[PDB]
Amino acid sequence: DKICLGHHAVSNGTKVNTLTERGVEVVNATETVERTNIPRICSKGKRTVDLGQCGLLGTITGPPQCDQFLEFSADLIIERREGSDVCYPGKFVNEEALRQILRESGGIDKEAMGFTYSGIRTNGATSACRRSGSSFYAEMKWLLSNTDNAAFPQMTKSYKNTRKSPALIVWGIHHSVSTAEQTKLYGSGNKLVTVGSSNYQQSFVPSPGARPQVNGLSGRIDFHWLMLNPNDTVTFSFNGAFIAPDRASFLRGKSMGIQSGVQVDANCEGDCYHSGGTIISNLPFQNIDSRAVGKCPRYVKQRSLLLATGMKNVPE
Amino acid sequence: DKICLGHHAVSNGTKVNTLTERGVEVVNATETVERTNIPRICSKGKRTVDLGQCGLLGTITGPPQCDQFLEFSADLIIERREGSDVCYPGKFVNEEALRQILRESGGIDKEAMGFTYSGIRTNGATSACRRSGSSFYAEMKWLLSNTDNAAFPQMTKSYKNTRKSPALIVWGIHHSVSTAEQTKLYGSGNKLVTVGSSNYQQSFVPSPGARPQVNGLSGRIDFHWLMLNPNDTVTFSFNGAFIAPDRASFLRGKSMGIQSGVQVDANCEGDCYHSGGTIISNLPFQNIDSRAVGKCPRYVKQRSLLLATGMKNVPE
Amino acid sequence: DKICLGHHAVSNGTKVNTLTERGVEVVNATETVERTNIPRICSKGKRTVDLGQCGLLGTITGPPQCDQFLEFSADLIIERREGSDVCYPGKFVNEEALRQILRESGGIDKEAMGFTYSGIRTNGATSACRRSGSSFYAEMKWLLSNTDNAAFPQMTKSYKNTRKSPALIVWGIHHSVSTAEQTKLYGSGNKLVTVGSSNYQQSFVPSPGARPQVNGLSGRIDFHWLMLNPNDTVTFSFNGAFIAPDRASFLRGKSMGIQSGVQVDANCEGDCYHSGGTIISNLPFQNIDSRAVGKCPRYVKQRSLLLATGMKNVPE
Amino acid sequence: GLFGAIAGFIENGWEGLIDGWYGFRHQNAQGEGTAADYKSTQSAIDQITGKLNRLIEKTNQQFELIDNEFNEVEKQIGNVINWTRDSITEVWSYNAELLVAMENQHTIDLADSEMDKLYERVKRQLRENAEEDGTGCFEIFHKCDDDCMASIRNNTYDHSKYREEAMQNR
Amino acid sequence: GLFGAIAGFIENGWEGLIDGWYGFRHQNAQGEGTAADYKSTQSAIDQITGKLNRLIEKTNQQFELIDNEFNEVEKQIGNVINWTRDSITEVWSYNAELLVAMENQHTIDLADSEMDKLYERVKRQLRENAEEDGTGCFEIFHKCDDDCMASIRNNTYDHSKYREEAMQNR
Amino acid sequence: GLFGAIAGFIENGWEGLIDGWYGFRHQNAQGEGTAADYKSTQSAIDQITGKLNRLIEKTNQQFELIDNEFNEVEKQIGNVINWTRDSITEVWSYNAELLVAMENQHTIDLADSEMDKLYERVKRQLRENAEEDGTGCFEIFHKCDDDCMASIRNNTYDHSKYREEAMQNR
Numbered sequence A, B, C: 001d002k003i004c005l006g007h008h009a010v011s012n013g014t015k016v017n018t019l020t021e022r023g024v025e026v027v028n029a030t031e032t033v034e035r036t037n038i039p040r041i042c043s044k045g046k047r048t049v050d051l052g053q054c055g056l057l058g059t060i061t062g063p064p065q066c067d068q069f070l071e072f073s074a075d076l077i078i079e080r081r082e083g084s085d086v087c088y089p090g091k092f093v094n095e096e097a098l099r100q101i102l103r104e105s106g107g108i109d110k111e112a113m114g115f116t117y118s119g120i121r122t123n124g125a126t127s128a129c130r131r132s133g134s135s136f137y138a139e140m141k142w143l144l145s146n147t148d149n150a151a152f153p154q155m156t157k158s159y160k161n162t163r164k165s166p167a168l169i170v171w172g173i174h175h176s177v178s179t180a181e182q183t184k185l186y187g188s189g190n191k192l193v194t195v196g197s198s199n200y201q202q203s204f205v206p207s208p209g210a211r212p213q214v215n216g217l218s219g220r221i222d223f224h225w226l227m228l229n230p231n232d233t234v235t236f237s238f239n240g241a242f243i244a245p246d247r248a249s250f251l252r253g254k255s256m257g258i259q260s261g262v263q264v265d266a267n268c269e270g271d272c273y274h275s276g277g278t279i280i281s282n283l284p285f286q287n288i289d290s291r292a293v294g295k296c297p298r299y300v301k302q303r304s305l306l307l308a309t310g311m312k313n314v315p316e
Numbered sequence D, E, F: 001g002l003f004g005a006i007a008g009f010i011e012n013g014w015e016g017l018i019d020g021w022y023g024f025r026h027q028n029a030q031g032e033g034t035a036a037d038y039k040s041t042q043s044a045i046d047q048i049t050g051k052l053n054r055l056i057e058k059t060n061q062q063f064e065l066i067d068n069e070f071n072e073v074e075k076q077i078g079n080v081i082n083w084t085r086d087s088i089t090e091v092w093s094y095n096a097e098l099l100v101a102m103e104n105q106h107t108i109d110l111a112d113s114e115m116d117k118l119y120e121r122v123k124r125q126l127r128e129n130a131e132e133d134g135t136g137c138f139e140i141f142h143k144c145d146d147d148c149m150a151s152i153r154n155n156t157y158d159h160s161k162y163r164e165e166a167m168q169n170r
Ligand SMILES: CC(=O)N[C@@H]1[C@@H](O)[C@H](O[C@@H]2O[C@H](CO)[C@H](O)[C@H](O[C@]3(C(=O)O)C[C@H](O)[C@@H](NC(C)=O)[C@H]([C@H](O)[C@H](O)CO)O3)[C@H]2O)[C@@H](CO)O[C@H]1O
Pocket: A124, A125, A126, A127, A128, A134, A142, A144, A175, A176, A177, A181, A185, A216, A217, A218, A219
């Protein structure tokens, strides 16, 4: 006598939100916000450099813990909490800009500046920089006066970048424990260091005094930098307190840089990274870390947003 | 013989916009952009500090107009146009970063640095800083040479932050009206001031000369600052032109800071503030001030966007 | 016996994307992402200044290539690759902030500072700045000591902005090829230059040394600036190495600034510009240049997004 | 409207209907009356208020100052801030304009739907007793006192009771 | 489509219909003809052009340069700018993709709706004179010369005129 | 739902229907059976999976670090970054909330539509053989063995075969 029409239903429906309602039950739904983290840096198929105890900036100047990283090559660069840019207490002017540059460099390739010295000592060292005995920064040279208290000859040294891409140049200013100790190294009177590229001018006067003990030592070195363009020349006019660049660095290509405290893993592949690991997901959004880098779902404040994949559930 | 079906209608409909039309008349609509301002800072239930004539940065160094604000405590901090960070003409290096810090500090708590002096005068003052007679910044001390033209002993003073959170440290460089007047205060020859925290290095050389008259006075003081971390030590090496910190500040917790020119009001409560007052609204958007701070509707350029709360109106 | 109902269709339908499908064929569609560029700066009806060989900042100081731009007036300002801010090798401190200011100034109007000198030479020049013979920056004056090696009298010069809007003030520090050459111009001993506005304090010590040859010359000039407010006074205390402002600049009103390498054209009108030309479009979005300025469609990564302007196509 | 009822085959609304959103005006031997359908009315109202709740649900995020209205910040960093803020203003102004237009379209169609739902329900009650007019009206062949019309409104109208007579009255 | 007419119970469209969007192809003793329904056609067109106006309504905001294509800005501040701009680019690329998809869905359904609206109107004109085919066709029991079919198209067709004869022709 | 079928004139769904989304439960002299309509079921499924593909289609943009979790960046520039990031977070959180709500509404209505499409198709097959119940059921006047009911499900049911007898059985 009859034929009825109907639709399916389930005992257990999944609740979702609409334009009109909150918690309307539908047949089936699927999550759109990713919460699952892999607690490892998923590095399968990528040239990876885990800096460990080496600080990214320390790859340019080369303290002992960066000896194995002086000319590295990478698609992915991992910075560790324990990493350190210096052996002899110091600081980089514009540290973070230079980091951002090195993070996406694809690594670095070094080339001798070809500086040659006459009238000064260039083998200065320290117990802070240990290579089985006192030493110094591998890529640098600590410039002095030949004998204690001796004068410093006003000096003009130049480097022309003859290559096709710009050269990262780095030099260091020394700050001795006393006003007395700056005179010992480089003679009395106030010394001047200046730098002149075709698109750059700046000046540097040392500032001796008594800092607190770091690595046992109370002196400091200021590191500085500029990118020197093709067929441009940088000139170093100085009279002391100067730490001299021996090699200039060049950037290899492209990479990505991250900061983490989890292990590396060549078994899983991912392109979205944060300090706690890797977000492997096809979901449009994520609620794991708003500072995740690489190619990631968009961060959102919501923990979950369920998307209906079925009709409304109408049981009973 | 019949039963007709129909829907309601009104003589006066409200016009709205759709995907397809502009100004389609519907039965009823409601606004979604807030235009109503309360012209008062609605502060009910909040620890509020209205700085008045005191400048936020002046709470750290303490000119006379900030004497009652040296250790304040707040959920909400209100800066006034008339507020002033200095009595003796001066300026803060990085003023705005330090403001942003103090705005969300929850206020400050001061602790004696415990500096102790031998060989110099520390009671320097001025007519600009009036506490019934010439005076100076409450939290600071103006360091000198014992007698006119006398030398300045090269000095090494240190403070270790022994507490669990970082300490805001502030010191001031003095710039006298002449090259002659810098010699009077601190003796001739060029003086040096430097600062060395485990994550910080910088140097300060004074710069005497003739500025224009402010508060009647033509000299200036440069104020400077760093956050000193737990179990780290800051060292002050100097030879003159230095204004010495007596207390170090610590941040109490959390707050919000705003700038306004309207009265405070403990009768109304709000969480969205601007300089003209308070936005009390549940509407998703606002067209009042795009720089409103706190927890606010999103600013939008549109004055009004009407949302239909009824069917289309079809009269006659 | 019958009447059928139907809808239209076409042999050639346009494919589009929906919420549910990709490449569903509809009757007709229209593009929403603009790809068409006009390869010219469309300047119809606008006061336009094409700086050509003059650098925007060079309009303030006035090297020879900016002689015709010293008091310009504009709605639209065009910077060229070939443009140059200097004749005698130099650099602006805060160059880009000052550019952004000048780009939207509406141009500039100059007014004599009224500085008057006694005890020094003020006619210094160079072969780099050619006006049929050696010369200097039109708006500036190169200050010296009357005779070679002579002293420099400690000098206090002031300007009060008496006008209703703030004055752009610019002065230049000179850096000579030697420590010997700074003494020739301005006598030996270390010179000091300082600047004091009611909301500004800074100091400038010269830094002689050997830079590389630019325009044939190996010295440099540092240019600096501040905006001086109505009824405020700027004071210049100095002892040498100082390049003196002769006129102060004032901003005329409003403009827009762009950078380009295509021709100007008064036949077409546009309000969206980039370096390759003009985007003339009513489309909500564009895929031409994400750095386009003016009033433009929103840049999007997609090359094309087709919007259905007809029903689904169902042929055969 | 998408469903072709409101401003559609129903030529216009009723200003006399102040009791609900949708209703009936009958006509018979006993004269004209009117009423409101609660069920249909409430289903539109509850959906509409559902939208409102959704857009008044705004526990917002804190933002602090990053510039200064009394002491202008350094100019470079000022222009970056202003550019960002203006870019965000543009996004939100777009979002708000689209939200309300998008929502308003749905509202109008939603109310159109509910009217159609009520209409078809009624048609489904009167199986061959009444026939369609086209103005939004059901012409009844068998007669209906105020008791009948109230039975339709209450969902209690029995088609089999008046079947044969209306059938033949065709 | 949401309303089940276009690409639905109407198997396909007409390429011969160049006169409007929706129309009639009749059949009778006098042969086949065709025409266009203006009212329905115009209601889709006017709605569609309403969308277009809406998306071409763009009095835009001014933005200035905050970086430099000839003289690269300081690197830190350059990377903040680029990050912001890329973030804004992402938002807009999403917004545009969603807008057009969202709009395109509605367009398709909207045209589907209008066809259904026209269909049901016609059904409502022929009360028991015609019956439903299912392909989108009304089989008429009483005969209809070109004068009749034009009366339907003009909204002038009177069901009571041909009632009894079509009724019995069942 | 917008089309008034699901949670509408169909009072509830069938938990016994595990074979598809939409289907038939018949009743006749030979007893009750049940089945699934593939065509209708697949059209909802394919539309729904179309949405999913659309939201899993995310070849994303690269972003790098602009701040530092180990060595805090200068404070001014830190607060600008954080303000920007929080502003972008707000936009996306809004976008995601709106997308899913907007999408979920459509899904529900879309499934409601397909049920209605199937319903009306069937009605269109049984021209005056059956009449409408109102619960989502067609009462058949002429009898139908399991062969008949399968003919309806296959789109092969011929109304003219059982016309006169069902007509008179009225
Ligand atoms: C820790 C303690 O008990 N007393 C400190 C003492 O450390 C410090 O003298 C320094 O002692 C350390 C060892 O802890 C080094 O041996 C320093 O010597 C060197 C160095 O290793 O760096 C030797 C090196 O050859 C010197 N090189 C040059 C080029 O000059 C350097 C260098 O001069 C200084 O690092 C620059 O200031 O020093 C030794 O200085 C003293 C000094 O303040 O203070 C005790 O209290």
